[PDB]
């Protein structure tokens, strides 16, 4: 063909993006990674989506796992391969060793296997093939060279057959060589590397497309998660900067604030409330979530610091009843510890919820909490995730950030996310006569006018009351002001 | 001969400057890298260019990839090789192994292949030769010493024949030995290393001319990109300090601002707009991007923080009308997340757009965003790149930076780009009576006078209104002045 290689869609969520269409038709993609990375799973999701979505027959060749075990473990994702096998759509060809015994199984092996495969393909009219762990085959007594040739033979005979194949391989080091023999990376046309990176005591899964001879692909590692739906990849670096923006306004749940914001937050906008511990971020959230129920809209509240019990105790105490918001089915509370998983897991958790509850407002009490430990880049990436997800989804996001130091805060955010956010509400402590009073400033607002006032405010059972600025002070921001004016009133 | 080693141009963008001229004639250059680095694409771009620019025949010896595949793959970049083959300008010598099977045909191995490569050179009057993955050949069962002889012999037969060769090898360690057997390094005259260095979930491609017997060449790694047009290297260090410089002015889209700058910006200049989050850089960017259209001059606005939609929104609330700008074909919006690529790539995309649109003004909203995560050195290199480019293309550039701390920032740029810039507009907050007012200062202008006052300003639908300075205050730069009555 006078054309540049074409790709078969895998349908594995996110992979097709990273691969600019899927896998090159007629060629073999090697998928390698250490133990428990998702090799096998990937190979099955590949054949499975083929059958279900394009009615393209597949042949799964297995060297170590038993056809029963393969079907069985597939139920973990709601896949009945047993049924597909029956309908002649899927054909697992068992090439594993019988628990008994026979020697010299390396000669005929490949050859007899190739026509076994050939016959299978020809037979069920298959378009997709998966060979799970070729590695275990020469794992009989071979050296690099014997591996290089044997491989080249199977890739080649397979290519001639016209099958779009996925071959699996095991590794021993997360970043060491690509595949056991350091010979496979070259013999294959395409190379994909699945990583199960430790780092901390957490494990981050990532997928990289090392090379796709003939075409272009995204470069690098992409975090992904195995779920009850298989491999789910998040091309955070593929998400486009083309989200929608309306001048539609919506309320903060605190009128005076709405005023300060030029008349309520924009519907399309990511909000951030910062400030030292205890200033009142959670309050503005509660009042923010509520406001979405009072108007009969749906809102979720992912809290990483407090519980569902405490969030309800303190919320009632500020006048709004979360209980009802629940029953009526307009408010949904999540709750979980930042350590209960890794950033890639949370982002998905979040994305999930959002799909089943279709919120109109979303609040994440404390990003500063999800930044506990994680790397700064890994974090920033996460923020783009949630942020960028809700933004294109016309969801108003309110995020919290506790400043690492009360009073004297020289930077809005310690993780520098400032640029990623549309609106920024600042809460700070002001020392005024041996007493600690709050201040509330609408630091910025992208589309609106807002008010440049550092208004003090109080919290009570009614909630937050926004009073007036400290016009007669110098160094408010510092948290430790000073009074001015030296002329009271005298005669002429 | 009696003179300076002659060099054959590769025409591979940027490589000839790196190698000062091209690849040494009649000698063979070793090119190694790990899988997916572009070894093949290099050796094919070598022959392919020889044929298309110089009508120099080429012979492509393949040891693993199939001839039809090598052809097919090249379509990636829009290169019909089947044709070049059919016209006799290129010949793909298929030396790979039989898919079927045999083991006693290659007993005259090395020698026979030399007579085949040799017969082909004389046949097609080949000048350039690419041997792809010689490595896999001895990948049958050999020891280092055995590889140093066969390699030597070959290289020699081609040097005798007089062909200028490109032999490609494969590595396993991005920074370990140059080739599998740590023997090819020294059997070749030239060594070029291709690297796909990971480093933080992102890959960066670099090229390095490790050695070139007999001549000089640029030392160290240069970053490259494999695009639709093949390899493409930016010799960022090879860019000289030879940009033209006029005294002609241009407006900032804000009269008063042009007044503070002694009559606006200099056409040939890099302007920096620093300020804490919210101060108003984008408001300035927009007004700058608009002034180019009113003058019927093209301008590109590379956004990395907001969107085409939002920008358009916010632009509208400040007056103007980005919509019209677009239609009229006077303004172009880009948009992309820093993460949506590595610095090397972004640089390109930018370069790219500029070429297809020939803008008079460029605005990169938030350099500070581009600097996210990357290394400071790799970032400086990026600024020197974009900057230097516009500076040589007579393009006026407005770059934006957001300081990490609002108020009291003690340096214009955290990444330290100040020196690389001609003019620096600075925006800061100032606490006046429990309120947050703005201030704008033309911190520096290399060829003009410019006002030295720290004037306050408001943002209204109409736009930015530069007013008067805080004369009766002390420590305004501290963010929290001290009104002295
Ligand atoms: N329903 C599920 N939800 C979440 N994770 C799961 C689920 N099922 C399996 N997993 C995870 O995926 C893993 C299975 O790995 P998998 O069988 O895909 O291939 P592998 O380890 O790459 O290769 P191989 O097991 O053949 O050596 C489990 O170990 C577990 O970590
Ligand atoms: N009924 C109430 N009356 C007066 N003040 C209250 C009442 N409830 C809470 N507060 C005040 O509000 C503060 C609680 O903080 P809040 O729930 O707003 O979250 P935060 O400051 O954002 O984050 P964190 O509490 O984790 O520091 C307390 O410090 C307290 O002074
Ligand atoms: N049109 C294209 N646009 C962008 N990138 C491309 C395009 N075509 C190929 N690529 C990229 O270039 C690479 C090609 O590498 P190439 O086949 O030239 O040799 P190699 O990777 O050095 O060695 P090997 O033969 O072992 O793969 C691909 O892996 C891919 O990342
Ligand atoms: N319609 C408007 N009317 C009055 N003021 C506005 C209006 N729109 C925006 N503003 C003001 O302008 C500021 C917006 O900043 P701008 O869009 O210019 O970029 P920035 O501050 O430089 O950077 P970033 O917003 O990415 O942090 C807000 O802080 C706000 O005070
Ligand atoms: Mg707290
Ligand atoms: Mg709290
Ligand atoms: Mg390679
Ligand atoms: Mg190659
Ligand atoms: Mg900013
Ligand atoms: Mg901005």
Author numbering:
A (entry chain E): 14 to 505
B (entry chain D): 14 to 498
Give excerpts from the publication.
A mixture of the KaiA, KaiB and KaiC proteins in the presence of ATP and Mg2+ exhibits stable oscillations in vitro between the hypo- and hyper-phosphorylated states of KaiC with a ∼24-h period. KaiC, a Ser-Thr kinase, contains two phosphorylation sites in the C-terminal (KaiCII) half, and harbors ATPase activity in the N-terminal (KaiCI) half.
Various mutants, including the KaiC T432E/S431E double mutant (KaiC-ee) have been designed to mimic the hyper-phosphorylated state of KaiC. Glutamate or asparate substitution of phosphorylation sites is a common approach to emulate the phosphorylated state of a protein. First, in the wt-KaiC structure both S431 and T432 are engaged in close contact with R393 from the same subunit, but neither E431 nor E432 are close to R393 in the KaiC-ee structure. The KaiC-ee mutant was designed to mimic a permanently phosphorylated form of KaiC that is unable to oscillate between the hypo- and hyper-phosphorylated states. Therefore, the latest results indicate that the KaiC-ee mutant has a severely distorted in vivo rhythm. Despite the noted structural variations, the KaiC-ee mutant is clearly of use in biophysical studies and the changes in the overall structures between wt-KaiC and various phosphorylation mutants observed in the solid state (this work and) and in solution are not dramatic.
